[PDB]
Amino acid sequence: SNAMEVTVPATLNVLNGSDARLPCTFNSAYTVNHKQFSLNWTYQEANNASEEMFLQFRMKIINLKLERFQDRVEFSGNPSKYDVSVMLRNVQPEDEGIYNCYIMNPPDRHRGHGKIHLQVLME
């Protein structure tokens, strides 16, 4: 094909105080090689705000411990089965925003992008 298919919910609605799993799966002809696979997760308050990386895969999962998320971010995927989902525990109203997943799976030439708008409902 001409692109890496990435499957995410365009809008994700979560009750304040609950856990938010951000689902992100992708398609590729090639087995994921942990020594070359790349994964980037970023947050932005809005489309015109800067992206803040909070998780990366380089050889292993790297949790950047972004301050706005405390220690509530967990990797919730499995690259060997094409799942790069993240978990956000105990969501607060400030977690509302745009979450981007960027994927590269060498030697696959196409790179992937998923974009989720997380909205926090009143509890």
Author numbering: 27 to 149
From the paper:
In addition to 55Cys, the hβ2 crystal structure reveals a unique motif bearing a protruding disulfide-stabilized loop formed by 72Cys and 75Cys. To determine if this loop regulates the gating or pharmacological influence of hβ2 on hNav1.2, we mutated 72Cys and 75Cys to Ala (C72A C75A) but found that it is functionally indistinguishable from WT hβ2. The lack of effect of the C72A C75A mutant on hNav1.2 function suggests that this disulfide bond is not essential for folding, and that its disruption may not significantly affect the position or environment of 55Cys. To verify this hypothesis, we produced recombinant hβ2 extracellular domain containing three Cys mutations: C55A, C72A, and C75A. Size exclusion chromatography demonstrates that the mutant produces monomeric protein, indicating that the bond between 72Cys and 75Cys is unessential for folding. Furthermore, we obtained a crystal structure of the triple mutant at 1.85Å which overlays well onto the C55A structure. The only significant difference is situated in the loop containing both cysteines, which now displays a single conformation. Although the spatial organization of this loop does not seem to impact the ability of hβ2 to modulate hNav1.2 gating or sensitivity to ProTx-II, this region may yet play a functional role in modulating other Nav channel isoforms.
